[PDB]
Amino acid sequence: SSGRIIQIIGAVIDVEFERTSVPKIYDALQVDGTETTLEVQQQLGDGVVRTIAMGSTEGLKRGLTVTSTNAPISVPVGTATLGRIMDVLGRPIDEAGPVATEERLPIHRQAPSYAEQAASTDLLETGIKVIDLLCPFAKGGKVGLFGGAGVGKTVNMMELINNIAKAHSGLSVFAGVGERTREGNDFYHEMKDSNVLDKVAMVYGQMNEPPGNRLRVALTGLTMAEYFRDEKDENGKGRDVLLFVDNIYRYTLAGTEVSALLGRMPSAVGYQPTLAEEMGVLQERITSTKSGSITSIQAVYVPADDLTDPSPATTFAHLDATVVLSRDIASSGIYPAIDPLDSTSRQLDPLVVGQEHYEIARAVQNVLQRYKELKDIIAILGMDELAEEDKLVVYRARKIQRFFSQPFHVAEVFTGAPGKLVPLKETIRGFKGLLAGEYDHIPEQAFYMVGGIDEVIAKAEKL
């Protein structure tokens, strides 16, 4: 039946229905006379459901009627969404007319069972030096980037997009990136002129929308990724569609913004009481079943630049390869700013990567960890005092810290230097030579934004 608005505080709106027509949870509702829609969040008895409005609540007052759709927010899914940009309810915002698709799926659905879980077995090169050595990737996996504001998460995400997505064929990629509009508008434009917009779908929401829209952006992108992977062309596959979300944190930020208005008591730091389950129900659906595969990359925000915050700490358990960015390395000039320590990948096993790769990675991490503990001694007593076996460790640690730096194709507007790409074997060869004590006469200033070893040799010669 039809209800009425009885209370409105910011985004949270509760609508009182009849005795027997109370809409179920997540049963989108349409407000007559306005472009706003409401989704049910929790029941309060007496025939009152406390909801969240999708869109601005300015222009509305108590007393307005509402019609129940009795179905979750459904989005258009199909082959016709390729090359189109749409808002969260699925309305196109590219001034290109409607979308010709009849297939529609709800954005709220259960999770895959334990039976239909598939393993991941094949590596996936990316061209970055530190990632291909200390944190190997694998198709069908889950990857996350951990950083504080201003440390370079995006640039790395754009480099990953440019380095694997543009080359792999039949990908049918999906873009759920959400960021400062300036960065977005540029993407759509950049993708077009490169003529790769044909096999990409986009869902985008800004930062200025009320908490209703910011809460449910990721679910829409997940639905569009799920449809693609599941489908099978005759004698064909789901195209191994790839999902890239740059807006994972906002999900929890909007959740905690509206939790207090839904009556939930404060918990921990003040994060919402149901943080863990709310993160899990979303972070589970991004998986590869036996009927397909999904390769995802996420961006994880670190509030106040501490990793013990309840928000980024809960997300560690949900990922396969974790990349952690540090503010100090960024302030030191080294790009990309990834903490060699505190970064690990499940695929780093002697049976998967091999034998030489494992030894190289362990030796590098050991050298850096040893150098991390010699700072206080150098301070109190002179550098001269430490033995030579630690002088070697200090110098090799400095050289290794600069050699993990390379210039990017994407970030040429900032530095103005041409981009570079390095294959895995070159990385392994260079690090094997370095840990062996060769290249001990080359000054550490020749390892900066130089990429491959032969380029190191040439740059050292130029000095």
């Binding site: 207090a260 009556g263 939930r264 008591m265 404060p266 003040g270 109190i380």
Partner: protein, 48 residues
Amino acid sequence: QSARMVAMKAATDNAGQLIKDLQLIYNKLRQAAITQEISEIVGGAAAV
């Protein structure tokens, strides 16, 4: 040798004093943080 031993024992004394001060500060900060968190939680639970 005597001067080196003098410098070393002065360094030890300075380090011990610094350890004492740091321990005092750490305990004070730990208790203060616990109290502040409790006050915030009680205020939030009272507001709802």
